[PDB]
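User: I'm putting together a teaching handout on how sequence relates to shape, and I'd like one worked example. Could you take Histone deacetylase from Schistosoma mansoni, show the sequence you're using, and then write out its predicted structure as tokens right after it?

Assistant: Happy to. First the sequence, then the structure tokens directly below it.
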Amino acid sequence: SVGIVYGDQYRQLCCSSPKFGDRYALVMDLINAYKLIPELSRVPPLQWDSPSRMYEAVTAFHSTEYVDALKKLQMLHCEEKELTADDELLMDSFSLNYDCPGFPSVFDYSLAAVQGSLAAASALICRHCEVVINWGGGWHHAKRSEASGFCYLNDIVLAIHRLVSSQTRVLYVDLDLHHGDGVEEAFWYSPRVVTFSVHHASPGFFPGTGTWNPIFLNGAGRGRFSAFNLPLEEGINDLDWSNAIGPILDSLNIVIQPSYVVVQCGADCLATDPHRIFRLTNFYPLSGYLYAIKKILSWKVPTLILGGGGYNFPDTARLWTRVTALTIEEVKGKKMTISPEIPEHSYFSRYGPDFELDIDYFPDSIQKHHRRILEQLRNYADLNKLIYDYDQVYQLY
Ligand SMILES: O=C(/C=C/c1ccccc1OCc1c(Cl)cccc1Cl)NO
Ligand SMILES: [K+]
Ligand SMILES: [K+]
Ligand SMILES: [Zn+2]
């Protein structure tokens, strides 16, 4: 089956943040508006039987002082009084400030994503689902003891930790516009979780990594060569983005032979995102996103699909609704007939001006990256005693 994380309390918590507003409700109500929910198995967010078990779950990656500070931040932001100077100091020491402010539900909001993505991974492990989608998860910038980029708790790291502990290998694929630095760093020393991020990188552009450092770093210790990165230039369209990462994806799968794939599918690469770095689409005749997901799904490896960035809420909905239909098609083998106009539903009015499912958009260095990345993959194969034909992979490029 294809699983999808939602629930009534889950939806309220995913829509309680000041930055992402009601995005999750547009997304699930468009998936519902297109009659896709009956095709999907609902996966309920994981809950715990005590504070200690929750704490144990989250501090599998995050420090206990950080988790404590995040909960105290929520408590402070639920009272009238302003933070003391000592409380502002303590929040500063975890970067619980600026781009990661406090708000009345900040802890419950952050934990909800972890609940969602841990349950998603358990559904994969117990083989209840072949694919699970969590459009409320994917917060890849959060670090062990530091929020970043509106990511307070790294649900991806925790879901991946659960998967590899269930020899188990996980391939993480980060399609967000921005470098997936939190997940890469969590597994920097681990060869069993191979991380791969395609992203924009340029001087000054958040978060600064996943590019020349001048060498490309790629893991350390036993995780040497296990962190993959493909920084691309602004303006890239669907076909060039697809061709840039198509052969890398296929060769990673050939060589790593992963037990699970986790795909972060941040929607801020859309041409219509207020970022406007890349020019990808949701078009389905082809959308770089849809091309990448179809390819990963053709592998028939149990796969977690997650959300992430995406600041044009209706176009994120348009995209993720198409990705969700595509998953149903490739997994179940059932054709999905999506109408070209948005169906009438609660959020219909948000889909101005023409109320179509297509977004309103009219559409040397990568070969060096391919040679670099393919050499890293051989170094990874050699370091980890993996068996593969170096000519069947080089054929892909
Ligand atoms: O997407 C992110 C992270 C996004 C992000 C991080 C740091 C600074 C700005 C950022 O986003 C720009 C933005 C915001 Cl903060 C609000 C509205 C519109 C735009 Cl463009 N994770 O990978
Ligand atoms: K990325
Ligand atoms: K790694
Ligand atoms: Zn992003």
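A couple of points you could highlight for students: Residues 249 and 296 are 8 Å apart (CA to CA). Strands lie at 2-5, 41-43, 131-134, 170-174, 193-200, 227-232, 260-264, 303-306.
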